[PDB]
Amino acid sequence: MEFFGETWRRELAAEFEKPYFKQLMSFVADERSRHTVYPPADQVYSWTEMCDIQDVKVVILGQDPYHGPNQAHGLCFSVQKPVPPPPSLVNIYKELCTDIDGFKHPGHGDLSGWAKQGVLLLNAVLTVRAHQANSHKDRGWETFTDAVIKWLSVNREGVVFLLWGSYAHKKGATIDRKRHHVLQAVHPSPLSAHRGFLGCKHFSKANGLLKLSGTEPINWRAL
Amino acid sequence: NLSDIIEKETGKQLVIQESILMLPEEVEEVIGNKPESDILVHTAYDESTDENVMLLTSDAPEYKPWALVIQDSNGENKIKML
């Protein structure tokens, strides 16, 4: 299926045939017929394409896609080169500077270099109408991403979930705490970041957790 | 709509870069008041003043303005209930 990496399709295939997903697709088609929707159709499932499903080592959850021109490209927090890092990403990058020695602001906000190493950058909602935050909520995506998160909780082991802000804590509340590692913090948004996101050291702690499986760490620096 | 709301309040014509949903409890201590329901934290950067400028609204589809926060480099806030 178009735009969806095959190791992902194989495993999630039941979902696509389900009424709710089919009704999601034609909601999205309708939206595109009449408005601009972000990200572009061919980048909605970018996260399925940067790595294989077996190779996922870390999960970072997001909400919905940036709603400005050229920002979203189907990975949570990341922006298409050369868009400036949004305010939350600025704070993510601030945390990396003090958490990961040698980390250097890469001079862009494209996080694909993480995704290619097994960092699943998953928004819970996958599309948005231009200029309208949260405008595609409860149209089916929540249900589908719940399906993706379940599948990873059930079928993989030792995956580190980094959950930022309460909505993301919520979305990860059923992750099997025996088979996986969940780390929680408040959102990197400027409203909250100096209130627990800065100093959370999630990126090194993740690599500390990976090392217990004899799993090779994420090189957070390769952006 | 929303950047006009920012302009009226602060005289700055700015571009919202992101909108983050937060629980009432998530926003309460920072703001010193609890909103009736979820809030979207809509954030622009004012490059002139090196300030993060946040317009908190209710969720889509209403986006009713709740509060405006102006944050400096070290994260100190100036808060105005709307």
Residue numbers in the entry:
A (entry chain A): 82 to 304
B (entry chain B): 3 to 84
The authors write:
Uracil-DNA N-glycosylase (UNG) is a DNA-repair enzyme which initiates the removal of uracil in the base-excision repair (BER) pathway by cleaving the N-glycosidic bond between the uracil and the deoxyribose backbone. Uracil-DNA N-glycosylase from Atlantic cod (cUNG) shows cold-adapted features such as high catalytic efficiency, a low temperature optimum for activity and reduced thermal stability compared with its mesophilic homologue human UNG (hUNG). Ugi is a small (9.5 kDa), acidic (pI 4.2) and heat-resistant protein encoded by the Bacillus subtillis bacteriophages (PBS1 and PBS2), which use uracil instead of thymine as a normal component of their DNA. It blocks access to the active site of UNG by inserting its β1 strand into the conserved DNA-binding groove of the enzyme without contacting the uracil-specificity pocket.
The crystal structure of the cUNG–Ugi complex was determined to 1.9 Å resolution with eight cUNG–Ugi complexes in the asymmetric unit, all related by non­crystallographic symmetry. However, the crystal structure of the cUNG–Ugi complex reveals that the conformation of cUNG is almost identical to the uncomplexed cUNG structure. The largest differences are found in the Ugi molecules, which are very flexible in some loop areas not involved in complex formation (loops 29–35, 48–53 and 74–78), especially in loop 29–35, which has poor electron density and large B factors. According to the analysis, the interface area in cUNG–Ugi (average value of 1043 Å2) is smaller than that in hUNG–Ugi (1093 Å2). The interface analysis also shows that the average hydrogen-bond distances are slightly shorter in the cUNG–Ugi structure (2.8 Å compared with 2.9 Å in hUNG) even though most hydrogen bonds are formed between the same residues as in hUNG–Ugi. There also seems to be more alternative hydrogen bonds and side chain-to-main chain hydrogen bonds in cUNG–Ugi, as well as two electrostatic interactions in the cUNG–Ugi interface (Lys218–Asp40 and His250–Glu28) which are not found in hUNG–Ugi. For example, both the DNA backbone phosphate-mimicking Ugi residues (Glu20 in the inserted β-sheet and Glu28 in the following α-helix) are bound tightly in cUNG–Ugi. In particular, the Glu171Val, Val185Lys, Gln250His and Tyr275His substitutions in cUNG compared with hUNG result in more favourable interactions with the negatively charged Ugi and the DNA substrate. The larger binding enthalpy of cUNG–Ugi (−25.1 kJ mol−1 at 25°C compared with −9.4 kJ mol−1 for hUNG–Ugi) clearly indicates that the electrostatic inter­actions in cUNG–Ugi are more stabilizing than those found in the hUNG–Ugi complex. The co-crystal structure of cUNG–Ugi presented in this study supports the previously reported DNA-mimicking properties of Ugi.
